[PDB]
Amino acid sequence: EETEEPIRHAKKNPSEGECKKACADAFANGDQSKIAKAENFKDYYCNCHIIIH
Q: What span, in angstroms and rounded, lies between the C-alpha atoms of 53 and 43?
């Protein structure tokens, strides 16, 4: 079960990889195993898919 969370990324249109890294940094301090995927939500926003369990 994942939860969506649009975070603020420092890039107008970050690539999903950039987003995943940011979602990782901001949520797991860099760990990308807590993040299923991330994708551009809007300008400077990435929708993080946070894996709860």
A: 29
Residues after which a C–N gap over 2.5 Å breaks the chain: none
Cα–Cα dist 53/41, whole Å: 23
Alpha-carbon torsion angle 10, 49, 6, 45, nearest 10: 30
Give me the long-range contacts of 34-42 (CB less than 8 A, separation at least 24). 36/2, 40/13, 40/14, 40/15, 40/16, 41/6, 42/6
Left, alpha or beta for 6 (phi > 0: left; psi -120 to 50: alpha)? beta
